[PDB]
């Protein structure tokens, strides 16, 4: 009974262990050294996005990489022309307390996800001359954090409860529900496919998914503390998390293994915020040390610092194109960066 | 362009209906409360007028806002940092939760995890200069439930005085000493009586005390 | 639902005045900028004045700075024009049309029903040869303008904008920008063009189709219209 399903539990723990280390030898540091290290962004601030009132939560670039979405506690949703530094809209939103948002791949729903446990969905290109919410996704414990866009009517969010769900968007009910952790899950990735989504949760544990059956597809641990970032590579079969232990996991989808993990003594404190540059090569955290830091994916080294930041940097985004990035940070201030040359 | 002249106006036009709504937001005061259970956080919630409940009891020109959270039954490091900017937090405790051990958890009269729960609020490093209101929540039974029972098996260092006054001279002080930073932050306490107005005047008062502390650091003058 | 009515016009005595009041429905007409645009009888259209949104952006028409004035309420929803010393050549159709600035929109899209102006008894230049154009329906019809000066601003938006009038209807955008269709119009019509050198295209017209077809330019203060192609039956 229950002991031997511990027995098999302990038995199949000991083949997955033994799997992950029989990737030959795969010596990461002897094998992985190129001749293009990063060797300082110096990223300066092309533009500062002024104007949020708060800590800002959540930023989410555009499919044109010229509008962003940004969340902050001011209950405020604002969309940029990063181009020009203008707010193109302002959605007031009934919860001051987002935590993760996004942009429908066609830019005109940007439904976000809070601690109302609710994405409530906002159209954008409407006939009407006003941002307005379409559907609000309710029927999640914990509280939203990350939720994300499929297409116009398929959305997958990630909540406190450990357990992340699929909804359609004209119905608003769920069309499938993905329930296999055991914490509070904190993030959610979707990859360029569209097929698999991997969502990191405070076991210090992160799950695929499959978006049409619903069973997790393979796990993945390593982590001495819980998550609270994770972002798909731009390949779409890797990941990396960024965890309140000061330090960041790259994981394959398909090997177990840990590619690198980003950390320095320097830093006690853990990573907020997660994202990729289109090129798979820079990997920008948001950590809690009041300034972001920008981490190369091949030799696990800091290769780039944003100190531009007063206050914690919690969120950060790259464009489609990589052409900027838009970290928010805990000061109320979007530091749009490109770097130049 | 006359096209880009006119986003730009739109753009400051959003510049300043959202300025207008930020300095209003500020003038909203929150309250985080964190009552454990059976602790009348309702008696508070009912008396004052999924997820959370974001109680707007604005009542005396001051722009309340009570952030009322016992539905998230998870962790609590990855949402109680979303309140650093917050006036004061209403923690709430039932006196008469003394003698009370969990059935299943086998606890320490219900009060040790209390205490634990009152340790991790006042010593969080977002919660450092934050100032804690305490409510003694059933205060009134705990006139009755200590003449039948005393507090002796759980602190037998209490002096004793069969009154209220041992309520108050043994487990309060203890509260209030429990503050580390006793000097960057201040505990008020305060006994959840079945008054129609003190129940809450007493909130304002800390309100209004926090807010003037807060205001002498704002024009660099403390 | 949205519903651009406007009203006050009519007859009026030579030497007279009057209000053109233009009634927004269904729509937020707060964040959105008005236009007027008149259109004298059996030719082009004409720009009356312009309100951006909020009021801090005016302009007015060269053949009426002064003497026409623009003012819109939001409270009330609805908007307002009030000319003074109404001329003889002051007698044209005039429509209220609406327009919201920001990345990506649509200016210019939807069009009042419009009302007529009666009396009793530098800029852009278009040169447009040809007006009637008599094409049977079922195949292409490639419809061009001419504009003064080049169009490609550093924005990389050329601001022409193409408008069909119905026989007894009001107008309708069919390509802003010179390249991207509006909002409720079939793919059928396409617009494409460099700078100076551009053209209105329709893969096959249908009977509804009919009308005359008009070219638009944004870039400067100035909006001047023209004398588009015009399709007979």
């Known amino acids: 009974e229950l002991d031997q399903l511990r027995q098999e539990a302990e038995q199949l723990k000991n083949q997955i262990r033994d799997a992950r280390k029989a990737c030959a030898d795969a010596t990461l540091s002897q094998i992985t050294n190129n001749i293009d290290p990063v060797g300082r962004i110096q990223m300066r601030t092309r533009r500062t996005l002024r104007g949020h009132l708060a800590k800002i939560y959540a930023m989410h670039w555009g499919t044109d990489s010229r509008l962003l979405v940004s969340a902050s506690q001011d209950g405020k949703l604002i969309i940029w022309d990063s181009y020009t530094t203008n707010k193109v809209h302002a959605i007031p939103l009934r919860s001051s307390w987002v935590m993760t948002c996004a942009y429908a791949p066609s830019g005109n729903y940007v439904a976000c996800g809070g601690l109302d446990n609710i994405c409530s969905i906002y159209n954008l290109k409407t006939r009407e001359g006003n941002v307005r919410v379409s559907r609000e996704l309710a029927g999640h414990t914990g509280y939203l954090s990350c939720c994300r866009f499929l297409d116009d009517n398929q959305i997958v969010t990630s909540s406190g409860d450990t357990t992340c769900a699929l909804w359609d968007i004209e119905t608003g009910q769920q069309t499938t529900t993905f329930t296999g952790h055991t914490g509070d899950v904190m993030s959610l990735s979707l990859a360029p496919d569209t097929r698999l989504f991997v969502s990191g949760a405070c076991d210090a544990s992160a799950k695929l998914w499959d978006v049409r059956e619903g069973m997790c597809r393979q796990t993945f641990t390593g982590h001495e503390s819980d998550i609270n970032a994770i972002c798909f590579f731009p390949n779409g079969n890797a990941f990396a998390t960024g965890s309140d232990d000061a330090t960041c996991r790259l994981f394959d989808l398909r090997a177990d293994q840990e590619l690198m993990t980003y950390s320095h003594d320097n830093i006690i404190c853990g990573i907020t915020s997660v994202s990729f540059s289109k090129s798979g090569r820079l990997l920008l955290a948001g950590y809690d040390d009041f300034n972001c830091n920008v981490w190369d994916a091949l030799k696990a080294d800091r290769a780039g610092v944003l100190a531009g930041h007063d206050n914690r940097v919690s969120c950060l985004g790259v464009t489609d194109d990589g052409m900027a990035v838009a970290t928010g940070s805990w000061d109320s201030f979007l530091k749009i960066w490109n770097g130049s040359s | 362009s006359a096209e880009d002249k006119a986003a730009v106006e739109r753009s400051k036009m959003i510049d300043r209906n959202l300025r207008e709504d930020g300095e209003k937001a500020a003038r909203e005061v929150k309250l985080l409360l964190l009552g454990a259970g059976e602790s009348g956080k309702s008696t508070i919630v009912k008396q004052m007028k999924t997820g959370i409940v974001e109680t707007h009891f604005t009542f005396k020109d001051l722009h309340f806002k009570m952030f009322d959270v016992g539905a998230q039954r998870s962790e609590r490091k990855k949402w109680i940092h979303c309140f650093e900017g917050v006036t004061a937090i209403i923690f709430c405790v039932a006196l008469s939760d003394y003698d009370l051990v969990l059935a299943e958890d086998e606890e320490m009269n219900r009060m040790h995890e209390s205490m634990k729960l009152f340790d991790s609020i006042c010593n969080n490093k977002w919660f450092t200069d934050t100032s804690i209101i305490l409510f003694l929540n059933k205060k009134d039974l705990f006139e009755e439930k200590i003449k039948k029972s005393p507090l002796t098996i759980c602190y037998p260092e209490y002096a004793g005085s069969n009154t209220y006054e041992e309520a108050a001279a043994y487990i309060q002080c203890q509260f209030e000493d429990l503050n580390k930073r006793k000097d960057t932050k201040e505990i008020y306490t305060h006994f959840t009586c079945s008054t129609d107005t003190k129940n809450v005047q007493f909130v304002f008062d800390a309100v209004t005390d926090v807010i003037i502390k807060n205001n002498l650091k704002d024009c660099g003058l403390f | 639902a949205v519903q651009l009515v406007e009203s006050g016009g009519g007859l009026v005595q030579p030497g007279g005045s009057r209000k053109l009041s233009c009634s927004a429905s269904?729509?937020?007409?707060?964040?959105?900028?008005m236009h007027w645009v008149r259109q004298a009888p059996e030719k082009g259209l004409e720009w009356v004045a312009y309100?951006?949104?909020?009021?801090?952006?005016?302009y007015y028409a060269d053949t009426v700075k002064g003497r026409f004035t623009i003012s819109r309420d939001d409270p009330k929803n609805t908007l307002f024009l009030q000319m003074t010393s109404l001329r003889s050549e002051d007698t044209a159709m005039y429509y209220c049309?609406?327009?919201?600035?920001?990345?990506?929109?649509?200016?210019?899209?939807?069009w009042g029903q419009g009302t007529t102006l009666t009396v009793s008894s530098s800029d852009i230049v278009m040169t447009q040869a040809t007006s009637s154009v008599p094409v049977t329906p079922g195949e292409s019809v490639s419809i061009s303008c001419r504009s003064s000066?080049?169009?490609?601003?550093?924005?990389?938006?050329?601001?022409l904008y193409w408008f069909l009038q119905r026989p007894g209807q009001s107008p309708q955008l069919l390509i802003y920008?010179?390249?991207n269709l509006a909002s409720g119009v079939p793919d059928r019509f396409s617009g494409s063009g460099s700078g100076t050198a551009f053209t209105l295209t329709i893969s096959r017209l249908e009977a509804e189709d009919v009308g005359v077809y008009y070219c638009?330019?944004?870039?400067?203060?100035?909006?001047?219209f023209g004398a588009g192609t015009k399709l007979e039956l």
């Open positions: 049309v609406r327009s919201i600035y920001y990345y990506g929109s649509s200016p210019f899209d939807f």
């Open positions: 269904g729509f937020a007409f707060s964040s959105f900028g």
């Open positions: 309100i951006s949104s909020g009021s801090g952006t005016i």
């Open positions: 000066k080049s169009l490609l601003h550093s924005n990389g938006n050329t601001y």
């Open positions: 920008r010179m390249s």
């Open positions: 638009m330019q944004h870039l400067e203060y100035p909006l001047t």
